[PDB]
Amino acid sequence: GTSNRDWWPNQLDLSILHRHSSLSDPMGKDFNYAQAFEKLDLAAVKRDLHALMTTSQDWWPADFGHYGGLFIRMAWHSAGTYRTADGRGGAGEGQQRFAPLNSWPDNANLDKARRLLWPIKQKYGRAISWADLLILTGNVALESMGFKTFGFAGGRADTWEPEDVYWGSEKIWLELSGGPNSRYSGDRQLENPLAAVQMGLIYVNPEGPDGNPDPVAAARDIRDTFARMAMNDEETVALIAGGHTFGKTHGAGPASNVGAEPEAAGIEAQGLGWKSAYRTGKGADAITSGLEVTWTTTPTQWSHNFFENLFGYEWELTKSPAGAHQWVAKGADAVIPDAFDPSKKHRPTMLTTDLSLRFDPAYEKISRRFHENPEQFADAFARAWFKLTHRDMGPRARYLGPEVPAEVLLWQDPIPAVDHPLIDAADAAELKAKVLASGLTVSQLVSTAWAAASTFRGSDKRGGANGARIRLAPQKDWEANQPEQLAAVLETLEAIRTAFNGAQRGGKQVSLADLIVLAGCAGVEQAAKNAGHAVTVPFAPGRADASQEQTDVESMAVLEPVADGFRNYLKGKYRVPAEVLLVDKAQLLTLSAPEMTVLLGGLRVLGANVGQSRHGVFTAREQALTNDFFVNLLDMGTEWKPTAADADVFEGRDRATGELKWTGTRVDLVFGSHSQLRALAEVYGSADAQEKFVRDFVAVWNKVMNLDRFDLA
Amino acid sequence: GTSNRDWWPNQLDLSILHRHSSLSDPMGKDFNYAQAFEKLDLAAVKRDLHALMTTSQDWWPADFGHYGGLFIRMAWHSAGTYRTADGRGGAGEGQQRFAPLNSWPDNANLDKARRLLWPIKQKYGRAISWADLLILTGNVALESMGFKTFGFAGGRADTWEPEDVYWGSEKIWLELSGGPNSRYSGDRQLENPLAAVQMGLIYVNPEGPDGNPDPVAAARDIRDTFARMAMNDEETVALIAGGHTFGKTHGAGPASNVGAEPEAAGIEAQGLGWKSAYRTGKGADAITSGLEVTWTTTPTQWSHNFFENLFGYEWELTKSPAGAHQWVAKGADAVIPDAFDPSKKHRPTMLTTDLSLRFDPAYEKISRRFHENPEQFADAFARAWFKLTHRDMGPRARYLGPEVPAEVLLWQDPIPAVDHPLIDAADAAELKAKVLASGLTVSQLVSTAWAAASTFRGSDKRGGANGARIRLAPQKDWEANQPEQLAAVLETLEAIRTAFNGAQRGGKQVSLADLIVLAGCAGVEQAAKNAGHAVTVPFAPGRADASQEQTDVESMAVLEPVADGFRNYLKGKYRVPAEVLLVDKAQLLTLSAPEMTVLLGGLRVLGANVGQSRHGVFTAREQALTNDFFVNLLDMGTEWKPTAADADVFEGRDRATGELKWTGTRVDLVFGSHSQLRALAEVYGSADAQEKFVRDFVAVWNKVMNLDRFDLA
Numbered sequence A, B: 001g002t003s004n005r006d007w008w009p010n011q012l013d014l015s016i017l018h019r020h021s022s023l024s025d026p027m028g029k030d031f032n033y034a035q036a037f038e039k040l041d042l043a044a045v046k047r048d049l050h051a052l053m054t055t056s057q058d059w060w061p062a063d064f065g066h067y068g069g070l071f072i073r074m075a076w077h078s079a080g081t082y083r084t085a086d087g088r089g090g091a092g093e094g095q096q097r098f099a100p101l102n103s104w105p106d107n108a109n110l111d112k113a114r115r116l117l118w119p120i121k122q123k124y125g126r127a128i129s130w131a132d133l134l135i136l137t138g139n140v141a142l143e144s145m146g147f148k149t150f151g152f153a154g155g156r157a158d159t160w161e162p163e164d165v166y167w168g169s170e171k172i173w174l175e176l177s178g179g180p181n182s183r184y185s186g187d188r189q190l191e192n193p194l195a196a197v198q199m200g201l202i203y204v205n206p207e208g209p210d211g212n213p214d215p216v217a218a219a220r221d222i223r224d225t226f227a228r229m230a231m232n233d234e235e236t237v238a239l240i241a242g243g244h245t246f247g248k249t250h251g252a253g254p255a256s257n258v259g260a261e262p263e264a265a266g267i268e269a270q271g272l273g274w275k276s277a278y279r280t281g282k283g284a285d286a287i288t289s290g291l292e293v294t295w296t297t298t299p300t301q302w303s304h305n306f307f308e309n310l311f312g313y314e315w316e317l318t319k320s321p322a323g324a325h326q327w328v329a330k331g332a333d334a335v336i337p338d339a340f341d342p343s344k345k346h347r348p349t350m351l352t353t354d355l356s357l358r359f360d361p362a363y364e365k366i367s368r369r370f371h372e373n374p375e376q377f378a379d380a381f382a383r384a385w386f387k388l389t390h391r392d393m394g395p396r397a398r399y400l401g402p403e404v405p406a407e408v409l410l411w412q413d414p415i416p417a418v419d420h421p422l423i424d425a426a427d428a429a430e431l432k433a434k435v436l437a438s439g440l441t442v443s444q445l446v447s448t449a450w451a452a453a454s455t456f457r458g459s460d461k462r463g464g465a466n467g468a469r470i471r472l473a474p475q476k477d478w479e480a481n482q483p484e485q486l487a488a489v490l491e492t493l494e495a496i497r498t499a500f501n502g503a504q505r506g507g508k509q510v511s512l513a514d515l516i517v518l519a520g521c522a523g524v525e526q527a528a529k530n531a532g533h534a535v536t537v538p539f540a541p542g543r544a545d546a547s548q549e550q551t552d553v554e555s556m557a558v559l560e561p562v563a564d565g566f567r568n569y570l571k572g573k574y575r576v577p578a579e580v581l582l583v584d585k586a587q588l589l590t591l592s593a594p595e596m597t598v599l600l601g602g603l604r605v606l607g608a609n610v611g612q613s614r615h616g617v618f619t620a621r622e623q624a625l626t627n628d629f630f631v632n633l634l635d636m637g638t639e640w641k642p643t644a645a646d647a648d649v650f651e652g653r654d655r656a657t658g659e660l661k662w663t664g665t666r667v668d669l670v671f672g673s674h675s676q677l678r679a680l681a682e683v684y685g686s687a688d689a690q691e692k693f694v695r696d697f698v699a700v701w702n703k704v705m706n707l708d709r710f711d712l713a
């Protein structure tokens, strides 16, 4: 059946904003996962998981009689898709069970792992999500094998359809770099927002870069990809050596024996894939990666044997039975146990990427320290494993259950606790009037609150106005935030705050985070008054102010908006058209296409553009909240043409006279071009729409101000 | 960016069931279009539309100073996409404004038409939908030009994204037949459900079949496509001759001057397309179809000139200025006015397809009768124009406003009015107890009500249990309805009905339509009792019984289910796999994926399968309302394989013994294979889900029973 995507493959795609509707959700509109999970008997689930670890099923027999290694890999792959660039990927939505991730080649045979967990999932039902179960199972694996984890939080609600994620442009699984859709350019520069070296890999190629088995070069790809998943050298080494303390790889025969991935398999395979014609197709005969390496002498027990082997031997390049490059210990005895035959033993073996931990000079220093001090290793790994598996969960307020670690970690972007009474409705009214009496304009107030709140992204639940990090490095210096203007607004609000807090009794006080948001509320109300409309904008206090010492400046860098169509901002020139970036930003803000539309048209006329650009400001009453953006955009009395200076800037001229009326960017004009977005703009551009426009604008403003308010819980 | 569709282009697509969510809708979820329209000042709208007809805009000047022809075509294209096979297409959703229809080649320059209407749309806003406005505008164009219409109903609510319709498999616009994706096979047999001859055309090619200018062969395509749009010979001649009483075609220069269709045009075109480099690109210089034909001596006034020309001249094959085949009157004087230059006149001209009305023997007879009796022509065209523009609106209870014709037409599938008291709750309980005391089984009751209600389709709002048409021809004889079983049930229910009605006073009676539905509800209730559960099934009386004379048997044939996965039925063997057909049927029933899932699992265990097949009946307590389908489907203790006799039937065997436990079809097993469907199945197959299953089942059952209840209004 030919589709619109076939006819117009470059048309903007809005369907990403309409995933996750109530249509596709099987749970009731009132289902609250946190409430279900809080009553789960977590100790009973962990006991069932523990029993499972050594209860082998014949359709996928357990290596060494223990599924621990398999489950650790499952949990590390669930978490391992995460990219800091956009926050997308990660374990927080259980996306490993849907396409494409369920059929990525790096996820081969994790379909067996997830099916082993069905009887438990079935037993506990809605009280434990698949998302939480995948991580929990990895923790119980570790614990059952003598490793003390750092803790665990529940709260990852299940999802019901695939996320629309850009995973690269290659059309062939695992394609080596340098092809027509290469994700590399220049001196091995991986394109943002990607965080893996080949399509369908978690991070790197275990043979080495594009299969070249050089540990030194592989180390470069390790460091680059892991940094793109928010891990530094210490954490990287800890995680890789930690993981590879357990279990084994599977490459017992040629890969051509392995059939279709789960999405391509026949209906009779009932959601499983990679069926293998090699011998029994499983157990002793399994083929997963094609590598056949077993790292330690006790693959089902925590040890420091990974580094004892890594440094205790010299390594020789060899081939697995499937033909893949891997390494074997020179002159060693057969000390490694076999997974099924107690009379067989094997020499120590390593991946190219394991050897990176010894041959890259910076990793070698860490690895030696871990080898000499295995208690340091165990602590690094436990911390790193926690971070890995929690990094997309958002603020600690979302963390559920009895095993949440009490230690507050910098990477969590922590918010201090509130320990005083909050402002009430009458206080909020008083503060809004004081803000408006100070002389701050609608434009300033809107732009500042927008800047503070719109760093949120629903992909990993980072950002938002909570914390007042807009006043700290690096947010205060981001170009989009207009640093000099920002500093003047913040100085005025901080003097308001000081005066209000100094007059209170009873310890009542207002945070600057709350006041920034409340002041934006005042600006929106004032804008509405300017247009002849009395409205109240909702406001919920309870935000707190974080310090500079609680703010990791390097980690915050990825939240810098380099494109924010809502402020008609583009930091530089990108390959992707600006309207595509607008829709991407709307997705991260959790906005539907109607919400995106109303919000953008309102912000234009409120003076939210960076630099006070007139692009898209289609009103003669700037700082009044009206539908003028839509009414003027849609006026067929105006003709639009790209300018000679810049193809991405358009002039709107009266069609009859030639007189210049407006200028706009692609982000403005897409609302009059795209057929779905224009249908939206027409509703808000209609003569009966002033009331609806105002109401819907206020609702979406408030939604944005509250995106990170997980304390309202 | 590579997508799941690119990796697995044959995977079943569920996103068609999740279009039209509250996410993409800009209106509040309480918006009720019927209420808005009922308050519209329709007379005022019509005055504005009258004014518009002769208010020419310089960016698309009006032919002959009157846009009436352009608007008639616009309205006929809006309605013209309709197919009786599935009810999809038609004017009822205003889909001409979205992709692909806004950019079909047959819809060239209708973008200009729609844009002329924006100011009226804007002025009246949400009180008149685009969908209603396009048809209303066509009516007003007719009335402005001297033709009295049969009436008009509002009520077509706007939609906000494209519908997923199969329009064909060709990858080239307008591709002629016999290609790798040909829509024709054999002796010019058009594949169901299609109703046009080439991709991007409304019905037929105006030059003739695959461009061969033979009016006799063009007639055959006309008759076949128009029959597929619910029109017979008389209606077809009336509509073509009626339409081509007005306006003109546009082909003033080569088609290569015409640039990108609206979905491919630059952003500066603001939603318009087909920009032409030929001379002024518009007006006198316009190019739409490439033909240059003006049919009558008064193109802006109703006349009887179409048939005077058709029969009064002999015709000669010639070419338009763009190279297209058309016909010119031999020896005629230059009597046809020019659209812009008062000093220029033209000879009469015709399309190949106009000449079909004279050279096809059956059409010639009708055309002559219309030529001789122009009042018959006028009346036929008026009725046909009404049908064309209303055929997808559904029952008359949906018709709004003060111009609705009082005459009840056969094609509306009329239901008599109810003129007596309805049964109350005590009566419903008494009837359900009588039904259960009669000996009718759960399986019978559920099957019968399912058969009655599931003929509904949301595409044109035809079908459903209202009318009790299941008792009439042809529904009573449909194989899927199990005619012998059906007769026995109906005989028992008719005796219950007669005895209840005969004991009433005060005029109270129950219709058979209501009793069929009520008896199904009793079956569901009894099934719940069988499983140890009290349950209440809602029921709303008020259905009436239609007569055989109110039930057009030929028109009803298109509602016959040749595939109904909800009853594990497939009438023969089709090209499209059975699970794709299941999703298609769910879409027509208006079901989401979770609703489809619960409903199918429940129907299986209640005995709704045609022929009492055991396929998918994964329970040892048939006729009990349980979640057994999901629990058993998901049991990894069973291994599935296709049978040798039939690749589309599967055997489920105990994995450890080889013993046969179940059999199933693709429709059963897809719930265990497709990664999104399996996630839904898991929710209903979990240990905590029995009550959820029951409740969700009853809800969707009730939804199905009420799909045609537009009287509950």
Ligand code: HEM
Binding pocket: A063, A068, A069, A070, A071, A072, A073, A076, A203, A204, A205, A206, A222, A239, A240, A242, A243, A244, A246, A247, A248, A249, A250, A251, A287, A288, A289, A290, A291, A353
């Ligand atoms: C450079 C990074 C890494 C590379 C290239 C990599 C590579 C691989 C490969 C190729 C396999 C074999 C799959 C098979 O054939 O079954 C695997 C197994 C495994 N990996 Fe990694 N790994 C990396 C990091 C990690 C991390 C961060 C962890 C967890 C902290 C992890 C834990 C495991 C475990 C436990 C197994 C064993 C699976 C089993 O016993 O079935 N690995 N690794």
Ligand code: HEM
Binding pocket: B063, B068, B069, B070, B071, B072, B073, B076, B203, B204, B205, B206, B222, B239, B240, B242, B243, B244, B246, B247, B248, B249, B250, B251, B287, B288, B289, B290, B291, B353
């Ligand atoms: C066999 C069926 C039909 C064929 C093949 C056909 C073909 C066409 C073509 C090629 C045009 C010229 C488009 C352009 O170049 O501007 C057109 C114009 C038009 N058609 Fe038809 N037509 C058919 C049936 C209809 C019907 C059923 C109606 C209405 C009841 C209709 C009403 C019109 C009118 C009013 C125009 C003139 C447009 C103008 O003045 O801008 N036609 N037709």
Ligand SMILES: [Cl-]
Binding pocket: A088, A089, A090, A093, A095, A163, A165
């Ligand atoms: Cl994601």
Ligand SMILES: [Cl-]
Binding pocket: B088, B089, B090, B093, B095, B163, B165
């Ligand atoms: Cl449709």
Ligand code: NA
Binding pocket: A087, A088, A089, A090, A092, A392, A459, A460
């Ligand atoms: Na994420």
Ligand code: NA
Binding pocket: B087, B088, B089, B090, B092, B392, B458, B459, B460
């Ligand atoms: Na339809």
